[PDB]
Design a protein around this ligand. Structure first.
Ligand code: NVY
Length: 171
C-alpha cells in the first residue's frame, strides 16, 4: 500500500497552532520548515517523479488584526498553477523510499521572474500538495497527498512576532 508520511509533523504543528506564515519575495524565499515526506509502497523497480504545488485553502484573504488572523477581504484571482519538480526526478521507487524526500530548494515568490519559483498571493492561505507521477505510463497515473499540518499564509513580512521568534528558534 502507498503511504506518504509528513516528516517533522510536531515541528509543523508548533507553527500551525500560531498560524504558519511563509515569506514571499521578488527573487523567491526557501521555506522553513522544509517539507519532507517518507514514502513506502512504491514499486522499488518503477521510475517516478515527485511534484509539489500549493492549493488555495479559502475563497477570501486573511488579515492580522489585534494579534488574531481574520478574514481580510475577497481573494485575488487564483495564482498561476505553478508546479515544482523535485530535482531527483525521475528516479526509482527504491530511491524515493530509502530516505525522506526533501523539498529544501523550492522558493516562494510574489513576482513571475522565472527560476522554477512558486508564485503565491500575499495574505492567502495555501496547502502544500505532493504528486507522484509514474514515468512511461500510458495511463499517466498520478497520486496526490495533501498535508494540512503544513498550511500557511503567504506574507511579504511576518505579522505574528511569535512566528518570527519560532522561525529563529527552530531554524
Ligand atoms: C518540543 C516540541 N518540539 C520538539 C522539537 C521539534 N522538532 C524539531 C525541531 C527542529 C528541527 C527539527 C525538528 F524536528 C518539534 C516540536
Amino acid at each position: 500500500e502507498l503511504r506518504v508520511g509528513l516528516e517533522e509533523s510536531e515541528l509543523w504543528l508548533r507553527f500551525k497552532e500560531l498560524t504558519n506564515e511563509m515569506i514571499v519575495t521578488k527573487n523567491g524565499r526557501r521555506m522553513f520548515p522544509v517539507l519532507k515526506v517518507n514514502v513506502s509502497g512504491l514499486d522499488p523497480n518503477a521510475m517516478y517523479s515527485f511534484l509539489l504545488d500549493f492549493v488555495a485553502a479559502d475563497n477570501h484573504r486573511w488579515k492580522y488584526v489585534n494579534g488574531e488572523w481574520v478574514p481580510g477581504g475577497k481573494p485575488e484571482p487564483q495564482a498561476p498553477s505553478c508546479v515544482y519538480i523535485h530535482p531527483d526526478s525521475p528516479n526509482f521507487g527504491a530511491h524515493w523510499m530509502k530516505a525522506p524526500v526533501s523539498f529544501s530548494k523550492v522558493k516562494l515568490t510574489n513576482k513571475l521572474n522565472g527560476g522554477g519559483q512558486i508564485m503565491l498571493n500575499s495574505l492567502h492561505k495555501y496547502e502544500p500538495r505532493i504528486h507522484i507521477v509514474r514515468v512511461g505510463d500510458p495511463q499517466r497515473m498520478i497520486t496526490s497527498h495533501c498535508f494540512p499540518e503544513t498550511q500557511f499564509i503567504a506574507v511579504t513580512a511576518y505579522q505574528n512576532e511569535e512566528i518570527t521568534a519560532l522561525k529563529i528558534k527552530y531554524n
